[PDB]
Design a protein around this ligand. Structure first.
Ligand code: HBP
Ligand code: HBP
Ligand code: NAG
Lengths: 524, 530
């Protein structure tokens, strides 16, 4: 009975498992319950704290993945399968994971808390690319990750109602942070130094924690990778959420209270079966159930809140990958597939824009088209394909990120910004997709330190650098090891390219183009 | 005759002429200056089509420039070469319909290609007798026959009550057309070949050339065309029949005046009175528009130029078009607040916004916003040097560069052989400040070869450069191809190739401000609609 693997938290005793990292052992505590299972009458409801338990709770294995749709687009294809659930689905899914140095830190160690993405309809803390062992071993970090409800279970709201308030998926994450304040010290972690990091929808989630006062006392620093609380996809108005919830209720055969009672009687797989039809669409740009501007968790729209916020004592690292848009396209944009080079026509490009910017009027659509057409090669299929990617990535990620960076910096935050440009040698998506979002994650978590995953030796050195930047940032609010990475500011607009070459400092994050999205389009 | 130089006596349809032997650097040329081609459009003929000149008796002396057409005289910088060189250099008069011919000396024995110059000046000014339009060098060095004509400007040339008989519009254009006819009938007397006539002009001159292309009765009078920094399409070169009616009616009121009675009252106004009011007809801080320009009358112009270049068949046409490096800079010193010849004209963002309202007076608030956002440098949105240069680009692109790109594109798509250039050499003798770069009009002295005159103090390289240009233009006049048999490829819609003209050899470039001209030529219009 290894004492390094026995920990007492407020709810009782836990036994973890000693795991192997390339450089030595780590202690892992997997599948720790942090809430009462959100089932039966608790579906759609805020999470309640986990009741205390007797004896020694087995925390040696990942718990169930929160009930969700599973992507079937390319059955057996690595590129897709790696994001799919790797444990059983279940509404009973509120568990977090902790990795620590073995033996557990002498003194309080900075804590990083990961929050996965997945568009608010999918994701899981148990995916291999979120494995915390490398950060724990090589950098001595205490790493935490939590499951949170997605889809209808997490974000279906009847705003103003008592039994389906909206944002419960974000309350899930908040309860895991609270759990960290209360228990992490028992693992050798410092509750006084907590850094949130997340990607895509996890990044937006981190954002929403920044913008929601009750979360602010639970972390000190934040990293948003390829996602933001602002922008087209991450939030929905109270009105529009009510509409979607009602449409979905109707789609499954169902006064708020009665409606919600009827939904609660539905088998999980029924809700998922109809999730997507609430917003008929050709691709995956919008999802029906995402966080709602409830005037509670989010007192106002993220736009309103970031423009007027005071961010004096906040440090933030944010960044994008080289090809934010490419991933989206293979999911229902005609002309695009993983299996050919996706050289598209002009006509296809125009229709692509109606899909990627679903909210756009005819005029707005044309402005986009005319901006992104290369007038020297108006009909070159290669240009059109790359442009389609750019439109979609700029509108959804790159410009929302540039705008967040700018507002935080203008309003007191210390901000660092990056563009990630290395394409994993092991990517199974085609070359034309470049560096799609999500494929920086495995480097940050240090997977290339595992020789059995067959990354190049430079890729290993690269991963070591990133783990340093991220953990330096968690330690100190500054990614530089104690050329330099300069703070992003509104004046100079400096960010850095992360790739195999040494840090390069650049200025202006798609500045002209983001002025188009952030200043002009709105007026239009 | 008897004792006079036998090479200077020539007969044209209207009578006998005595020209003058002039010295050019490489030897003598024959000049015939001030030949009347119309009845003086004075008195009851004001605002009317030109009538062909009635034959005279005796030997008309053709040894000096004739009157300059009545016009506003620029008084922005008294004494300043940079403004003065454009100012009238002969007496102002309504009696001003004369043309000029330069020919080799002795006159060529076989028929020689004819170049006809049409000056610019916003349709409110200009004269064929300015020094920078001196035909002597082209005649002496290239053996060309060069012809230039005065045409009516301002109200005299363009005041229109569309539909009236007494003031139908476009008579200034009709003056040019009459001179083209006079060349068809008479140029052979000078050794010129009426079967080889290339029109060339700059600014309003170019827009003029473009309108002769667009107007069928002019098309039989010439074979090839050069448009320097101007086009029949674009925001300044034409007005609608309704708008022209409105302006003439307003001008009539400003001076104290049924169309017949109105025009009769105008005809009693002293020329200087019309001139003193023409600019009030359209209140503006700066010279981007003029009140009296070619009108779309459904006659001379059967539709808008925009429509005609979209629907036109131009298979037979060879055309040379281009722009100078800084088309906008000139405009700014004429009343955009913040801008001056005497300082570096660093401006604020607010001055830039305000400049954009003035430079694009037709823009809604949204359109103006789009323009500002497009031309803003988002890395340094507040930098006064970039803002100054962006004000110049906005006004240059909207008024000349983009109308020219659109012109080259339409013509090329529709059968024409097009050659395109951007001229980037700033004369060493220029008296405008450096910040203005190469303002429009400052390629002209090189095309006309002034730097071969050693007394003008151009550098040796400028002299070699001017020869290059004279060769390009006259090869084009001769053969439809500026190349001498590095190459100047035609401009096409696939490749969009054009050349830089400067002291270095030809360099081929692709796309004439392509992104930005997509903004002005495709997007802005639609923003107009909403
Ligand atoms: O809840 N309904 C889900 C559903 C059902 C039937 C058809 C389509 N959907 C949407 C999403 C499909 C899977 C899309 C997931 C794409 N993806 C997977 C992994 C990593 C990234 C991404 C997309 N990045 O843009
Ligand atoms: O006919 N009305 C004339 C007038 C009267 C009172 C105030 C202003 N105006 C307009 C024009 C002033 C002179 C502008 C001439 C500028 N300019 C001269 C020579 C060569 C080029 C240019 C301008 N190029 O853009
Ligand atoms: C330059 O001259 C103009 C006209 O006098 C003036 O309005 C402007 O403020 C001056 N600009 C600079 C940069 O000195």
């Amino acid at each position: 009975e290894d004492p390094q693997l026995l920990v007492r938290v407020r709810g009782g005793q836990l036994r973890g498992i000693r795991l192997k990292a390339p450089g030595g052992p780590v202690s892992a505590f997997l599948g720790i319950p942090f809430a009462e299972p959100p089932v039966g009458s608790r579906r759609f409801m805020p999470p309640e704290p986990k009741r205390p338990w007797s004896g020694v709770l087995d925390a040696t294995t990942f718990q169930n993945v929160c009930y969700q749709y599973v992507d079937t687009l390319y059955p057996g294809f690595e590129g897709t399968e790696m994001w799919n659930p790797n444990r059983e689905l279940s509404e009973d899914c509120l568990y977090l994971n902790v990795w620590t140095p073995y033996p557990r830190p002498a003194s309080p160690t900075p804590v990083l808390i990961w929050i996965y993405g997945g568009g608010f309809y999918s994701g899981a803390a148990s995916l291999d690319v979120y494995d915390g062992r490398f950060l724990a071993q090589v950098e001595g970090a205490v790493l935490v990750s939590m499951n949170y409800r997605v889809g209808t279970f997490g974000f279906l709201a009847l705003p103003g109602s008592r039994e389906a308030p909206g944002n419960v998926g974000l309350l899930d994450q908040r309860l895991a942070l609270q759990w960290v304040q209360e228990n992490i010290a028992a693992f050798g972690g410092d509750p006084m130094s907590v850094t949130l990091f997340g990607e895509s929808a996890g990044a937006a989630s981190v954002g929403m924690h920044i913008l929601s006062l009750p979360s602010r006392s639970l972390f000190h620093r934040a990293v948003l990778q390829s996602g933001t609380p602002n922008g087209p996809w991450a939030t929905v108005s109270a009105g529009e959420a009510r509409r979607r919830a009602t449409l979905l209720a109707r789609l499954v055969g169902c006064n708020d209270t009665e409606l919600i009672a009827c939904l609660r009687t539905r088998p999980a797989q029924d809700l998922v079966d109809h999730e997507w039809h609430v917003l008929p669409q050709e691709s995956i740009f919008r999802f029906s159930f995402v966080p709602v501007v409830d005037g509670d968790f989010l007192s106002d729209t993220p736009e309103a809140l970031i423009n007027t916020g005071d961010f004096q004592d906040l440090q933030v690292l944010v960044g994008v990958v080289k090809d934010e848009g490419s991933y989206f396209l293979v999911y229902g944009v005609p002309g695009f597939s993983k299996d050919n080079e996706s050289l598209i026509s002009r006509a296809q490009f125009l229709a692509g824009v109606r899909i990627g910017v679903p909210q756009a009027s005819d005029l707005a659509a044309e402005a986009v088209v005319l901006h992104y057409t290369d007038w020297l090669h108006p009909e070159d299929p290669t240009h059109l394909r790359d442009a389609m990617s750019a439109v979609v990535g700029d509108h959804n990620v790159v410009c929302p990120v540039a705008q967040l960076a700018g507002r935080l910096a203008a309003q007191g935050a210390r901000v660092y910004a990056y563009i990630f440009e290395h394409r994993a040698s092991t990517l199974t998506w085609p070359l034309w997709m470049g560096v799609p979002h999500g494929y920086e994650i495995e480097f940050i978590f240090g997977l290339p330190l595992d020789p059995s995953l067959n990354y190049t030796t430079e890729e290993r050195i690269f991963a070591q650098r990133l783990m340093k930047y991220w953990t330096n940032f968690a330690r100190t609010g500054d990614p530089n090891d104690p050329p330099q990475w300069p703070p992003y500011t509104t004046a100079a607009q400096q960010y850095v390219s992360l790739n195999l070459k040494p840090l390069e400092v650049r200025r202006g994050l798609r500045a002209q183009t983001c002025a188009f999205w952030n200043r002009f389009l709105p007026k239009l």
